[PDB]
Amino acid sequence: MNLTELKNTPVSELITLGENMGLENLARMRKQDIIFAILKQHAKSGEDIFGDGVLEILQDGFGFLRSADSSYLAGPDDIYVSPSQIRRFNLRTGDTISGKIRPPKEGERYFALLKVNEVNFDKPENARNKILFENLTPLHANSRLRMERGNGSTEDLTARVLDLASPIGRGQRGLIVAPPKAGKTMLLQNIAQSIAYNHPDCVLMVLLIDERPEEVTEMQRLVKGEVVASTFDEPASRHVQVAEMVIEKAKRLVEHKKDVIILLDSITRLARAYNTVVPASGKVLTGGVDANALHRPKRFFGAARNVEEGGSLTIIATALIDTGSKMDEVIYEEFKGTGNMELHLSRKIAEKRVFPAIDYNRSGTRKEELLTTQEELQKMWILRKIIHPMGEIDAMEFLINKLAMTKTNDDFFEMMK
Amino acid sequence: MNLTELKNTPVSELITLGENMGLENLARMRKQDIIFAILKQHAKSGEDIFGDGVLEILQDGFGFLRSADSSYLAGPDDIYVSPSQIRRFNLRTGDTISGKIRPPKEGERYFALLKVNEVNFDKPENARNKILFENLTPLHANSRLRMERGNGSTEDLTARVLDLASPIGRGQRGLIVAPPKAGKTMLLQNIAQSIAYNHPDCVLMVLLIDERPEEVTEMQRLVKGEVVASTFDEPASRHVQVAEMVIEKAKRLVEHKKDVIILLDSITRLARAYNTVVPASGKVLTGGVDANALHRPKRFFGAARNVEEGGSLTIIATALIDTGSKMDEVIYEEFKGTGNMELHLSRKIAEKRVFPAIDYNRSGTRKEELLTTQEELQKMWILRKIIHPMGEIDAMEFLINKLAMTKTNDDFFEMMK
Amino acid sequence: RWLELGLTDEEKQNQLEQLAEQYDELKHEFEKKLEAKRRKITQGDDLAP
Ligand SMILES: Nc1ncnc2c1ncn2[C@@H]1O[C@H](COP(=O)(O)OP(=O)(O)O)[C@@H](O)[C@H]1O
Ligand SMILES: Nc1ncnc2c1ncn2[C@@H]1O[C@H](COP(=O)(O)OP(=O)(O)O)[C@@H](O)[C@H]1O
Ligand code: BEF
Ligand code: BEF
Ligand SMILES: [Mg+2]
Ligand SMILES: [Mg+2]
Numbered sequence: 001m002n003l004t005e006l007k008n009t010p011v012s013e014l015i016t017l018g019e020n021m022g023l024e025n026l027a028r029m030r031k032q033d034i035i036f037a038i039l040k041q042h043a044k045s046g047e048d049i050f051g052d053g054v055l056e057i058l059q060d061g062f063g064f065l066r067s068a069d070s071s072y073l074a075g076p077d078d079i080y081v082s083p084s085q086i087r088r089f090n091l092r093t094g095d096t097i098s099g100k101i102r103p104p105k106e107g108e109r110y111f112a113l114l115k116v117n118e119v120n121f122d123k124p125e126n127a128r129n130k131i132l133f134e135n136l137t138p139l140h141a142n143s144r145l146r147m148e149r150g151n152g153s154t155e156d157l158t159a160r161v162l163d164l165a166s167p168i169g170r171g172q173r174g175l176i177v178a179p180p181k182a183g184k185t186m187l188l189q190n191i192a193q194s195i196a197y198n199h200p201d202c203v204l205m206v207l208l209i210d211e212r213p214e215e216v217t218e219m220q221r222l223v224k225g226e227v228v229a230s231t232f233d234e235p236a237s238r239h240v241q242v243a244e245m246v247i248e249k250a251k252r253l254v255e256h257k258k259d260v261i262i263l264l265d266s267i268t269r270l271a272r273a274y275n276t277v278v279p280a281s282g283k284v285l286t287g288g289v290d291a292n293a294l295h296r297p298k299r300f301f302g303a304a305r306n307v308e309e310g311g312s313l314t315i316i317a318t319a320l321i322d323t324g325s326k327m328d329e330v331i332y333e334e335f336k337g338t339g340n341m342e343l344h345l346s347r348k349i350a351e352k353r354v355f356p357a358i359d360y361n362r363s364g365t366r367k368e369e370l371l372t373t374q375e376e377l378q379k380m381w382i383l384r385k386i387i388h389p390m391g392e393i394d395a396m397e398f399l400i401n402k403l404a405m406t407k408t409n410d411d412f413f414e415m416m417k
Numbered sequence: 418m419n420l421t422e423l424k425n426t427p428v429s430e431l432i433t434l435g436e437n438m439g440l441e442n443l444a445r446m447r448k449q450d451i452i453f454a455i456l457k458q459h460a461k462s463g464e465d466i467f468g469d470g471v472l473e474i475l476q477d478g479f480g481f482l483r484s485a486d487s488s489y490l491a492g493p494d495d496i497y498v499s500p501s502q503i504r505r506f507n508l509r510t511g512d513t514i515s516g517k518i519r520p521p522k523e524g525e526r527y528f529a530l531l532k533v534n535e536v537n538f539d540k541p542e543n544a545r546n547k548i549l550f551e552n553l554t555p556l557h558a559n560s561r562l563r564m565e566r567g568n569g570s571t572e573d574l575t576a577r578v579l580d581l582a583s584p585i586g587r588g589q590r591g592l593i594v595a596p597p598k599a600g601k602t603m604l605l606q607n608i609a610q611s612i613a614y615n616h617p618d619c620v621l622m623v624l625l626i627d628e629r630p631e632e633v634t635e636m637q638r639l640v641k642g643e644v645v646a647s648t649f650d651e652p653a654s655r656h657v658q659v660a661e662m663v664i665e666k667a668k669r670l671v672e673h674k675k676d677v678i679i680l681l682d683s684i685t686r687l688a689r690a691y692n693t694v695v696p697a698s699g700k701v702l703t704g705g706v707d708a709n710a711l712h713r714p715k716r717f718f719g720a721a722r723n724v725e726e727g728g729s730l731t732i733i734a735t736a737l738i739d740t741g742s743k744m745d746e747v748i749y750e751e752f753k754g755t756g757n758m759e760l761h762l763s764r765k766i767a768e769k770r771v772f773p774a775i776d777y778n779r780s781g782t783r784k785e786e787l788l789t790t791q792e793e794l795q796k797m798w799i800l801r802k803i804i805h806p807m808g809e810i811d812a813m814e815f816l817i818n819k820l821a822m823t824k825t826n827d828d829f830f831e832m833m834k
Numbered sequence: 835r836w837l838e839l840g841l842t843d844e845e846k847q848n849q850l851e852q853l854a855e856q857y858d859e860l861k862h863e864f865e866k867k868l869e870a871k872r873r874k875i876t877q878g879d880d881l882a883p
Contacts, residue, residue, distance in 0.1 A: 090445050129444050135428050138630040283696050286705030291693035292652035302650050305630055333742050337597045366598060524866055532851055
């Protein structure tokens, strides 16, 4: 059997599968316990297992292959691999590996890998000959990620407006500055849908950190691809674990010449987590925040770059402002100008209950002539000059009406001429 | 072999060199690990090594010779030297040393220097007879650093305008007061290009502190000489380390009668770093900033001076204003009048999207009759009197048109007569 | 304490450099020996669980 076919099925499927396997009443155990029992029952007939897991190493030396069911945490379904395999096949954290595995043998309690088959969807030949991430040379984005769907429905506005507000490129360092309860959830839903429709080749990744389970399930059933999430049912340990797991997975992918686009929300919660786990170095500043505790979020935002020969790693992270927490204030202050793309959402326009609510004059992209063509850039300049003198609510209503009479951006362009 | 020839080559060159050396698959290790392995393989054939590194001392007594690949940080390529050599050859921090080195011997793990060859590009004779930095006598600049290229291309404006806005002299204490996203990056790119074209004798130095890797690589491939950088992938420790390294390197150079011109960006990030590392002395003022924590930036801005017998140390540092951080405000306040050259950039003109955006009435140089000649000074007076009554956007457009019909400054001068 | 001298490069510099290299190598080897002895005598020994 394969593990992924036990992965993609819901709990009732596992129930009926165990009933087929002639097992005891299994409605009481975790899904992973059911998968473990079913795999043991299947291998008792003299069968081998096929598994797939993202690799993680501790200082203990040996490695663990986690699945996305528990958002890459320890469990009875994860595979244990010896340091010998890591030394031989040149394995490292984040390297997703798929291949033959066996149930735990006499005295064992977790699965063990037999033969590697796909290292990050690649043969071990070129997987061992992998270019290092930090040894690469960053660049800037010329490949323009078109956010327009072209269907022109009622919500597609929030996407097409970005086509004139904040251009998106491969490997862009983007950050959202927004107050709570403004519309960021549906915004990232829209961006994920749009990038999946216009660019289905790039592997989609969404970061749900310190969120509610309803949002978790709503986003795991609406994104057009594999997703990861993390609620607050566990302390900051799970949060930092999933952050490292996803960052090393993206690093290994972009080292394998992949196009990764991570959507993080929200980054202030990741900062709070990294603060809570990291011990105090004896110096604290205003806000009850340690000095070098923000080093991990810094790094996570610095991982975004553009590879020269091929591949990119775009990171679009949302930040929370206007929450009243001065701590959060300082956090945003640390994130003043670290990214080259700013998406500013204001509560003042969202209180007028029109969506989206774009701060055109406050948002923008640095060095944007390298992303789009010349005529599109000139029309962007014209639109910026037209929108600068007016305010924000009137400007938003103007843009909404102009993009409501028209569907594609060329119509609005020629109408602005 | 020489270490610098392993320095200037990219990663693929090291890959093919290791393949020539019959080495294991080395695509997984750092560039410095590859250099270490290649040097070990080369010395296994009975060969000596030639290295070059900037020297740094801790309280431990012994010294470390760092390279510019890691922007002067610890690594497997840095050379370890005993305190005996520092006592004998009168070594100190910032003193770049080149000479014979050997791979680590039995029980060792870093390289060791055998015989010094070039102490700051000088024989040890006059290197031991070095005048002390603080024991020197500061002066003012008469040697005018002409910023005009003479080619008169589309961007050369931003340089030639300084020839009438802010004169540049050797050892000038210059500071830029500018809001984010205004055009400082290309501004310093222009200034570096212009000083390298007009004055290739003076060693160029650019400080990239707390920046993004894309800017790092864009500036390391556009400056006409060796450059140093530092991103936010490490905490303020790396920032303060590179600040001390570069300041001692410049001090040793100007003690060796060199002309150093450092370009720092941005200085507010250096202040934040020095605040984060230095523990609280029990007294804090408004802005969450310690009182004597700014002592290190102060010193760094005070290192600029003009040597009497020969050599100079010019420092041109950029500061960030209009960021909303009151902390930053206070920082700029501490930097109100510490420098004798002010370059004021305003977001109001940059929002009209014309470049450059000079605050002529707010920018200037103190004691400028000692820099240029008499007729040039009189024409500067005439231009200042003509530009004072008018505003800033109209004045900028006027200057742009006047320097657009003409190429060299003499044409604009005679046209203003 | 003032081994530093120099004149008539062609052979004197070579011989003085060789002898200074021998001296510093001997000093470093003896320092390594002393550090190894210190780490050996300061290493705590296991007694019982
Ligand atoms: N494009 C849109 N069309 C209609 N309603 C919207 C749109 N965008 C946001 N809203 C409204 O705004 C609210 C946003 O809720 P929520 O997801 O909690 O915001 P946030 O993403 O800031 O947490 C929703 O209740 C929804 O009714
Ligand atoms: N003199 C100039 N000539 C051409 N383009 C310019 C000039 N000055 C600024 N720009 C444009 O303005 C943008 C400046 O953004 P950036 O340099 O990131 O902000 P900052 O000025 O704060 O560094 C660049 O995309 C650049 O193309
Ligand atoms: F998703 Be809400 F802005 F907390
Ligand atoms: F480079 Be900008 F001033 F953030
Ligand atoms: Mg939301
Ligand atoms: Mg800049």
